Design an enzyme around this catalytic site. Sequence first.
Site, PDB file in Angstrom:
ATOM      1  N   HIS A   1       0.815  -1.203   0.000  1.00 39.24           N
ATOM      2  CA  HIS A   1       0.000   0.000   0.000  1.00 39.24           C
ATOM      3  C   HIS A   1       0.858   1.267   0.000  1.00 39.24           C
ATOM      4  CE1 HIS A   1      -3.488   2.538   1.587  1.00 39.24           C
ATOM      5  NE2 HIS A   1      -3.986   1.926   0.524  1.00 39.24           N
TER       6      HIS A   1
ATOM      7  N   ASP B   1      16.169   9.247  -9.521  1.00 39.88           N
ATOM      8  CA  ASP B   1      17.603   9.505  -9.400  1.00 39.88           C
ATOM      9  C   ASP B   1      18.077   9.478  -7.942  1.00 39.88           C
ATOM     10  OD1 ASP B   1      17.916   9.545 -12.133  1.00 39.88           O
ATOM     11  OD2 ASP B   1      17.667  11.722 -12.329  1.00 39.88           O
TER      12      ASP B   1
ATOM     13  N   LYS C   1       2.815   4.241  -1.874  1.00 41.00           N
ATOM     14  CA  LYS C   1       2.603   4.962  -3.117  1.00 41.00           C
ATOM     15  C   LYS C   1       3.727   5.983  -3.269  1.00 41.00           C
ATOM     16  CE  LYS C   1      -2.285   4.572  -2.039  1.00 41.00           C
ATOM     17  NZ  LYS C   1      -1.967   3.886  -0.781  1.00 41.00           N
TER      18      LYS C   1
END
Lengths: 190, 198
Positions: free
Chosen positions: B122, B129, B124
């Site tokens: 869950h 870089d 996100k």
Amino acid sequence: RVHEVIIFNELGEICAAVHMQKPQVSPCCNTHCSLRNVAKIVEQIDRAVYSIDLAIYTFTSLFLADSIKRALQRGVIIRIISDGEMVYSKGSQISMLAQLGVPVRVPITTNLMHNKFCIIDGFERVEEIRLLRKLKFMRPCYSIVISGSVNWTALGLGGNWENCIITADDKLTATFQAEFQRMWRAFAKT
Amino acid sequence: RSKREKASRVHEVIIFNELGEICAAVHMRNSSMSPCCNTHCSLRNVAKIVEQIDRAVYSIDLAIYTFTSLFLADSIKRALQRGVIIRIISDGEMVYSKGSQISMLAQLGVPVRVPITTNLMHNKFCIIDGFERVEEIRLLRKLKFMRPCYSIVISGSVNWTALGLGGNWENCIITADDKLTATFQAEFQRMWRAFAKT
Ligand SMILES: [Zn+2]
Ligand SMILES: [Zn+2]
């Protein structure tokens, strides 16, 4: 000051045998300890002086509900924004807090209130309380925001891969507090 | 003055709310022959996210619960075409969904790993870089140097959703903060090793 990311993952309970006003978390060697993560969140709530504004999708955690209950007993002003479908679902601690006199607002909508953050002693909000109480000086405090992917639930705090940021960063705390004030005025009372 | 330059780098909260499309008519009128005055413009929010992806030089590591947005998938494909190395971690169930763009990106050669469990992946977040990752790539390619770059992390409650699944209240932070980007990149590295293909 506070500035860290809390990470929940599959290693969160490998120290379970060690751990086998809450939680009370005896020391362990597990960097990823889920109990320590929950304790860090509770500690910020325990430190609230004037305000806690909480925008949350789902909230079932007893430990966290208890920390909010203690904040109320200290005189902290608490407001809750949530999702109308979940807000009084089975197991929701928001039901319990509303009974104790915490005001709750939700949007009238078919979409999801998925904006999950808690602002403690936000500058703008402490200043509002200062005016409403006609005070000139407040006790020292500083803004803290807790925000990320995690809901305050069994899966959120004790199963899923999740994260949340705890930070005193002035720009972040100010933005979240502003959006809470805006949502508060725009949403529907329960 | 170098520190001022660093401080001028991205550090903000993108907020999606119920006012995200109040400017729809302004944009349409613009289009008939875009700028709008809406603080909460959902199109500007999305542009700001894609802006970071478009600047990626070496790596994009993406840990995402659900990924159905074609517009974001296209930005990932453009990065792939510039030579950016993309890796995806996702949820074990949602990766099978019909609207999911993960299968599509897999077919382009993006490696995907998911947990073998019942619980939800869950997270996100997306690290662009990330220092530890770019240095890993330099070492793996046996190179003595890399082009200029800096780490950016995008993270919050926002899922990369198609317009038809949008309209929620959601947020994500976009920041070059060294401590935050390092911590997210470290957890991605750890999950990558821990997880399984398909
Ligand atoms: Zn432990
Ligand atoms: Zn607009």
